[PDB]
Amino acid sequence: MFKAVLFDLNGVITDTAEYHFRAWKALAEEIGINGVDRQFNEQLKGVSREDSLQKILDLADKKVSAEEFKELAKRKNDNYVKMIQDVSPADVYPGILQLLKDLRSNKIKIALASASKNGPFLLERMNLTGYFDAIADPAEVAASKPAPDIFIAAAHAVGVAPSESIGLEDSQAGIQAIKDSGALPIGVGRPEDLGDDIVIVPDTSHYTLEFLKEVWLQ
Ligand SMILES: O=P(O)(O)OC[C@H]1O[C@@H](OP(=O)(O)O)[C@H](O)[C@@H](O)[C@@H]1O
Numbered sequence: 001m002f003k004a005v006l007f008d009l010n011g012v013i014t015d016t017a018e019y020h021f022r023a024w025k026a027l028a029e030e031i032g033i034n035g036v037d038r039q040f041n042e043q044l045k046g047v048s049r050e051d052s053l054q055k056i057l058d059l060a061d062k063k064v065s066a067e068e069f070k071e072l073a074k075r076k077n078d079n080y081v082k083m084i085q086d087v088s089p090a091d092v093y094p095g096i097l098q099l100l101k102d103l104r105s106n107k108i109k110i111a112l113a114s115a116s117k118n119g120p121f122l123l124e125r126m127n128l129t130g131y132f133d134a135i136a137d138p139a140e141v142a143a144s145k146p147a148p149d150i151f152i153a154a155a156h157a158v159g160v161a162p163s164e165s166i167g168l169e170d171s172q173a174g175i176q177a178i179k180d181s182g183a184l185p186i187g188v189g190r191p192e193d194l195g196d197d198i199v200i201v202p203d204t205s206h207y208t209l210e211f212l213k214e215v216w217l218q
């Protein structure tokens with residue numbers, strides 16, 4: 001039996017991707033950079049604040065001091081955080097609270113494995129903090145998804161190996177990170193976007209405890 005689930009935040013528990021996109025878009029327009037469209041923002045998900053900024057600058061080969069790097073990242077995040085102020089336990093995706101409840105009551109460890117440092121804040125606002133045995137700190141990892149570092153760190157934060165764990169994700173990068181940690185990915189979305197070599201569910205209401213047990217088994 002699997003001993004842990006490792007949850008991505010955005011696109012599994014809820015999704016604030018629209019707000020990250022709007023804030024990043026707004027910042028690029030302010031610094032004169034074209035190309036931050038929705039297509040580009042697909043490669044920004046699963047990706048850290050620092051690495052998302054760098055991808056944006058790289059669009060125009062734009063060079064900045066480390067100080068003006070910090071201020072630009074701070075500008076974007078203040079904007080983003082202003083846009084997620086009304087997030088509540090209404091925003092939690094279908095089946096996720098029940099699954100968290102069923103995982104807890106069966107002694108299955110629950111870890112967050114998000115690239116966002118606003119993760120703690122959102123789980124608080126959604127009243128989900130209590131269910132989480134650990135929240136992997138994206139400040140402390142060496143690389144963004146698809147690197148496996150975040151899911152490895154998450155698994156370790158609940159004293160289990162990734163091989164004892166299930167990873168839940170909406171993104172290609174996230175799924176690839178799960179694969180390379182040694183955890184079992186179960187995706188949510190379309191198999192045209194994520195693949196046909198893994199189990200995909202069409203929405204998060206399909207993420208039930210009995211279904212996870214079935215998949216684990218094969
Ligand atoms: O899918 P998840 O890993 O949960 O979220 C990924 C998001 O993390 C955010 O970090 P932040 O909140 O600015 O520190 C990034 O700025 C954003 O570009 C990215 O889409």
Ligand SMILES: [Mg+2]
Nearest residue numbers: 008010011046
């Ligand atoms: Mg995600």
